[PDB]
Amino acid sequence: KFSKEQFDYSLYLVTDSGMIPEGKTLYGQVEAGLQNGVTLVQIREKDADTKFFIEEALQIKELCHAHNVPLIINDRIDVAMAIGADGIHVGQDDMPIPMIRKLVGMVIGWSVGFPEEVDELSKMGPVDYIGVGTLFPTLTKKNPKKAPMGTAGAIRVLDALERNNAHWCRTVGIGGLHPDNIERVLYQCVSSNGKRSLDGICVVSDIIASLDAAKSTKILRGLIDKTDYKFVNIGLSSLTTTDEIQSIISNTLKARPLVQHITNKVHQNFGANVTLALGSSPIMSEIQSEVNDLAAIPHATLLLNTGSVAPPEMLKAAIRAYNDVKRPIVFDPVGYSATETRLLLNNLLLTFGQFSCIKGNSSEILGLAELSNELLIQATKIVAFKYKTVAVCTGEFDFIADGTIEGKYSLSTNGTSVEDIPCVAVEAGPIGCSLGSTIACMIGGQPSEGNLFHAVVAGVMLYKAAGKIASEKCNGSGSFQVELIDALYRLTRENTPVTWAPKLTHT
Amino acid sequence: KFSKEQFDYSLYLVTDSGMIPEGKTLYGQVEAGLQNGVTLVQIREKDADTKFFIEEALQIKELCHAHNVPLIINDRIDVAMAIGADGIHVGQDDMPIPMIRKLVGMVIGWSVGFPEEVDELSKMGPVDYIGVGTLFPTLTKKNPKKAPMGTAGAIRVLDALERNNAHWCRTVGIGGLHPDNIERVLYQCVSSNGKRSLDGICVVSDIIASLDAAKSTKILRGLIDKTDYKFVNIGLSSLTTTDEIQSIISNTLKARPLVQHITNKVHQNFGANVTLALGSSPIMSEIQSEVNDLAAIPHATLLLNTGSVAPPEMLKAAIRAYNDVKRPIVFDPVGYSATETRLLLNNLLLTFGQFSCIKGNSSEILGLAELSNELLIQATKIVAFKYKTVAVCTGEFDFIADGTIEGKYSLSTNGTSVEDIPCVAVEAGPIGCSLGSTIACMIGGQPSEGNLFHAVVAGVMLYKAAGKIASEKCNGSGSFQVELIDALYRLTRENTPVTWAPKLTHT
Amino acid sequence: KFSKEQFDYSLYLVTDSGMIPEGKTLYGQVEAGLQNGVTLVQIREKDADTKFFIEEALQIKELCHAHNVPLIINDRIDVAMAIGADGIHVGQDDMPIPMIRKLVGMVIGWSVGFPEEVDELSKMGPVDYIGVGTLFPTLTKKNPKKAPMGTAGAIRVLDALERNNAHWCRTVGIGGLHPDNIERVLYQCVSSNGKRSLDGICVVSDIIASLDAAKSTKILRGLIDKTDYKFVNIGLSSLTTTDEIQSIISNTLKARPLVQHITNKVHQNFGANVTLALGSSPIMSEIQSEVNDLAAIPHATLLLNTGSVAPPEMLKAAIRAYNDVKRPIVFDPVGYSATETRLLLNNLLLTFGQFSCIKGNSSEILGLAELSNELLIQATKIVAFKYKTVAVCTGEFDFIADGTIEGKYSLSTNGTSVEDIPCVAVEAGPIGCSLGSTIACMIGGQPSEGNLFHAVVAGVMLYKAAGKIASEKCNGSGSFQVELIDALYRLTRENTPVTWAPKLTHT
Numbered sequence A, B, C: 001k002f003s004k005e006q007f008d009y010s011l012y013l014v015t016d017s018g019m020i021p022e023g024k025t026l027y028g029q030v031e032a033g034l035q036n037g038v039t040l041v042q043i044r045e046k047d048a049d050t051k052f053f054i055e056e057a058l059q060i061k062e063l064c065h066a067h068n069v070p071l072i073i074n075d076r077i078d079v080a081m082a083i084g085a086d087g088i089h090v091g092q093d094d095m096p097i098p099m100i101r102k103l104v105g106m107v108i109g110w111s112v113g114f115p116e117e118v119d120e121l122s123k124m125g126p127v128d129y130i131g132v133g134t135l136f137p138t139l140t141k142k143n144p145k146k147a148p149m150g151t152a153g154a155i156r157v158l159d160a161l162e163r164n165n166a167h168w169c170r171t172v173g174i175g176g177l178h179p180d181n182i183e184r185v186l187y188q189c190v191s192s193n194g195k196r197s198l199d200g201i202c203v204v205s206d207i208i209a210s211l212d213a214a215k216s217t218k219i220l221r222g223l224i225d226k227t228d229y230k231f232v233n234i235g236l237s238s239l240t241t242t243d244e245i246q247s248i249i250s251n252t253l254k255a256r257p258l259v260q261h262i263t264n265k266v267h268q269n270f271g272a273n274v275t276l277a278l279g280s281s282p283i284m285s286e287i288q289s290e291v292n293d294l295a296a297i298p299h300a301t302l303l304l305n306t307g308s309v310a311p312p313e314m315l316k317a318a319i320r321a322y323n324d325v326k327r328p329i330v331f332d333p334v335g336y337s338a339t340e341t342r343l344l345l346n347n348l349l350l351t352f353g354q355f356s357c358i359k360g361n362s363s364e365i366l367g368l369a370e371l372s373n374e375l376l377i378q379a380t381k382i383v384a385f386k387y388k389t390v391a392v393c394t395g396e397f398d399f400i401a402d403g404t405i406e407g408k409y410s411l412s413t414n415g416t417s418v419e420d421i422p423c424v425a426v427e428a429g430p431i432g433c434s435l436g437s438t439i440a441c442m443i444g445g446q447p448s449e450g451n452l453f454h455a456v457v458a459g460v461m462l463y464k465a466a467g468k469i470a471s472e473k474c475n476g477s478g479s480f481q482v483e484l485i486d487a488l489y490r491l492t493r494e495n496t497p498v499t500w501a502p503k504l505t506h507t
């Protein structure tokens, strides 16, 4: 027998019979998975008969204990005791947890997807681990009573385990993880205070349904025990010098970055001007087949603008297209909590991939963070940490938080809370979505060993800067706009940030 | 809690929510049958989730103990332990019995329908009761692995509970039992030594799916603790006197029985000739729709004869019709273990209803008993007993056994073994299917107070007696037949048995 | 038996047997509706056998005569003669009018939907009443041979009734009327000379299909004999004074109204800036679900721009949305008579809800009127009264007609003809879609107590004034645009209407 503090939840394998490829057995795959790094195993039989169930639990319990890996059994507690399994794992509609413990003394997993559930797990006291929500969409779970909750929904849970100090309860992520997201799920599924993250990733069809369980399992292992998530080929690491702003503007000019705008029509003419003005080239393509090719172009950058007529399967593909190539996405959730359809949509978009920067104004940034002038600072930090990103917040003061944290993940440095991440301010006195376009361009020109945080900061300066200049040569809102673009053009051409009006301080 | 000795299996109610009539509830029904008959209650939930299960099992355990009746739980032993059930009932493909008892110490049931299963039950020594095979076909059990077994099947199981002598184990019959067959089932489901019969009848749909459980349970009860099954409207209760054979032949003549022949085309024209001899009326309808109107007609009799190219859907329809009217049925299994399709077919027919007589010869009688001359006696006895009927076996001698037993059933008198039942013999020195036709005519004309056993014997005599007479006036196979029909005519007209050739002894 | 002049058309209920809620009878509905407001019944049986039809017309003619209400029969006139009915309603495909009149002498209703039908109903002399076209789409008319016509088409018909002086003819409108459109139908369905209006509303599925005929009938009555259609939460009532254009430009700035533009691409970026310059906020949403939320936002306003790629179902949704909250809609039929598809689409939109302003040019406004300088005034005035709206005609001069008549409606003050309404004009000497956006913004800012008319005027002035000024400060097409926005910016900021170039006269 094992002990609670002996279980290793790193790569937890949940089983499925009707899914194994033709000519391969359940024993066949599960072995391949043990040999190559699976570290816990659940047997899951929703359909078979109590006798065959047992017959195969004994055949697989043997296989496991030979690799010194435990064996949990799904919702059939009796079967579990029957065969001396090492733990059972029940969901929300199964046997109450108190009753389960009154027939065993041994490890229990509870399927949680909501904070309220964690509350009750705690009004119980030392339930030993929990499967966290359905992170993504998956057709492995027949007739499901929840919904793809996202990494944000899984954070909301990790966070309730801290409010409750439920130190005793481990966690695993489950529901549609494959190598195209495992990294991002590990990377953002962390409590705000930074003290706790996931204890392990849990797959079913990525191994069970693989032609090559061996190969597939070695990959997941590889993602799982690595600690740097390099999501965009730019460095992620002390105020921004003028000479830094400089070479940033040099690189972006020397590189002619192609910036793909998926935005409405209004922001569209304007945006492509600002991009052009910065020595870059806009592309307003929202065509799905094309998305793979644009992103492949050198120094290519994507700009996202909630509610743009483009169908979500295409924003999904767009985002994905670019994280595949390690390239920068800037996200501008214009709408947000303004409406029903928009809250819902952004939250969906935010689960499609990793963003390099999210820009919004006081209302937008406050909504995203789930919460003045001090308060703004607070919420920007909150959002930058919560989506692991550079998060800009605009207004008279622009605040710029860096929550990427070098791009480090782990299974519980993680220790750097929300409130410790560096955040700056940019002021120029009293004077939109063209900010998006600016940042996008700045970031897009940066070379390998460049820097993401400085780049965004340069962008917010360059923009706020041009704002003053234009603000002073306008005759009205009409001419301000054409002057704003002009200023942006002249400003980046005379590369002398030392002569710029906007002052950059610490938040 | 209860004790194994206190469980009453009289009327055993098994549960099924997905079948309950609109407007009514499980509690609804399960209450009604508690007030009106049920004596034991099993919860069956093959679909619902482990929580909901427990919720409704607790809700019903209270409803039961409220009537001092127990509550068994189907296949889910943990749910039993959890809610403090009084027993669990598993299947052949559910948890092994060893493992179950290693979790509990409380009653266990076991669904059986094959002597080998009883053989193992026995090599375990004191498993507590068994649900006996599928008796009849039922669409309540979704996707089944057995096949309906009939009373013949149930017997073969009871018969292994004595061979292995498992005093300690009780039995209930299950599946397809309705009011149209509970009597017949109770009646012929007794062990071959008469000692052990069923201890309970077990229904699911006859109550649960009833637009009035209250009424339906009252009726089921009425049957189960009644003790006389009067299947034919004739008496059933010391050698046959010449005066008895005489008033038998008068009755059939003064009654002109209508004898419906469902038989092949070669015994067809013949048998009609015999029936006509005996002052009866042949009708040869293998029409389904007509069957019930034919049985209406006064003193109507039915004669079956395997392999008559009427659909079994008709033979079922037909047999049923005459038992609903308590009229007699002669059964002749011409074919039998001669081929395959025949054995199959006869066995299915034998499950359709209750026969007043089963005639056959040497090969047939021996096949039916599942087993010379002392041997035919022992075999005729077995057949008679087994199918609770008067059994004629033809040859040199004709042996006639009476295994009806006044129509008695019990839930374990029943103790009147095979060997004991009355068996006579009729000889007449060295002299076919017309016997059946004759037997049918003799039984047909008896009135409520007449006696089935005598009627048959008269038949065999009369016939055996036309035998001698025609053997004498024949010139070969052709005229022998025409003199046999002729003799039969003369013999019954000059009704004076005091003169006929054959000797009736005591086998 | 009633008289011709004793028929109360107010609320004319038509029958339908197949559409009645399980549990209620036809008697039930009709009765219910009788007590609560119905003033005429017509039986309608396109299916049932003439015996059963009749059993029902009597039963029902009784229930009607008890509440002193007449009963008409549809098209089966013999059935009317047969049961002593008060009138028959026939259609266009039914028995010629003369032939009916030759067999009865009684009241006769005719389903009309085009002027031609009126011309015929005219050169016949004293047909009693007509049922007017199909106003809105409906599935209660199985296999329809017409096409929904809208209140627009209904007016065409009401106008042939004057060109013909058919003073002997009543009208009722029929076809898909429910509480979300009775008011509007009652309000705009009036003769071009205003001398004639509708004599009642006819509903089928609203009462007959209601799960509460009682309540549905009370509501409909409530609306039919009210006299105020307050359709926009603004005033509706002597040249517009400088002080007023000034208090107007304040309300709009101080209230920053959210203006939703459903327009193409080319009026999008441009239109958004005009909105911006006016201190109000652009929303480019063509999202079908947001549209309810957008209109719940304060001082919110909608601008339609025919042909905008937005699906017609969305335009309906959107238009409905704003009327349900009483917020103003600005309609700009750019395309119009230009093509086929456009003319078609524009008329579909016009019958969707109630607009507060329709802007358009010489071409557009001449088209809408179904019809220089003395001419545009005559046409502008028409388009205002026909669609009960403040209607603007851009050109060298700009013409504004207020045809909303305090929002009054009747059953025939109605009498204030196309010519009578106020029409003012706006000159600035010899100097695009911006005007819509401007007017949308003036109207949007207006509070409970404002006045839709002045607001519209203000906008036109402000837009015209802006023109003279940019026409002065421009060096070409492009500069002109940007100078136009600026002038609106400046002009409104220094809210000083006394000093504007454009002169406001009576037209």
Ligand SMILES: Cc1nc(C(=O)O)sc1CCOP(=O)(O)O
Pocket (backbone or CB within 6 Å): A014, A111, A131, A132, A133, A134, A135, A138, A139, A140, A141, A146, A174, A175, A176, A177, A202, A203, A204, A205, A206
């Ligand atoms: C068995 C099970 N429970 C889930 C939950 O949502 O909590 S997901 C899941 C299976 C999904 O895994 P995959 O996509 O790797 O097959």
Ligand SMILES: Cc1nc(C(=O)O)sc1CCOP(=O)(O)O
Pocket (backbone or CB within 6 Å): B014, B111, B131, B132, B133, B134, B135, B137, B138, B139, B140, B141, B146, B174, B175, B176, B177, B202, B203, B204, B205, B206
């Ligand atoms: C649950 C179950 N087991 C069976 C077996 O053949 O062992 S039959 C059966 C259900 C049959 O019930 P009814 O026909 O009365 O609805």
Ligand SMILES: Cc1nc(C(=O)O)sc1CCOP(=O)(O)O
Pocket (backbone or CB within 6 Å): C014, C044, C111, C131, C132, C133, C134, C135, C138, C139, C140, C141, C174, C175, C176, C177, C202, C203, C204, C205, C206
């Ligand atoms: C019988 C009949 N003729 C119509 C026409 O348009 O001429 S409409 C109509 C019935 C439709 O009523 P509702 O849509 O209010 O249920």
Ligand SMILES: C=C1C=NC(C(F)(F)F)=NC1=N
Pocket (backbone or CB within 6 Å): A012, A014, A042, A044, A074, A089, A091, A109, A110, A111, A130, A131, A132, A172, A173, A174, A202
């Ligand atoms: C619904 C489930 C949720 N979580 C887990 C796991 F993490 F594997 F324990 N298994 C499940 N079957």
Ligand SMILES: C=C1C=NC(C(F)(F)F)=NC1=N
Pocket (backbone or CB within 6 Å): B012, B014, B042, B044, B074, B089, B091, B109, B110, B111, B112, B130, B131, B132, B172, B173, B174, B202
């Ligand atoms: C398959 C079954 C067989 N027998 C019984 C009973 F007899 F009631 F115990 N219940 C079952 N569900």
Ligand SMILES: C=C1C=NC(C(F)(F)F)=NC1=N
Pocket (backbone or CB within 6 Å): C012, C014, C042, C044, C074, C089, C091, C109, C111, C130, C131, C132, C172, C174, C202
């Ligand atoms: C087709 C119809 C048109 N109009 C009317 C009425 F309500 F009488 F005006 N009834 C009809 N059945």
Ligand SMILES: [Mg+2]
Pocket (backbone or CB within 6 Å): A074, A075, A090, A091, A092, A094
């Ligand atoms: Mg479960």
Ligand SMILES: [Mg+2]
Pocket (backbone or CB within 6 Å): B074, B075, B089, B090, B091, B094
């Ligand atoms: Mg079972």
Ligand SMILES: [Mg+2]
Pocket (backbone or CB within 6 Å): C074, C075, C090, C091, C094
């Ligand atoms: Mg008609």
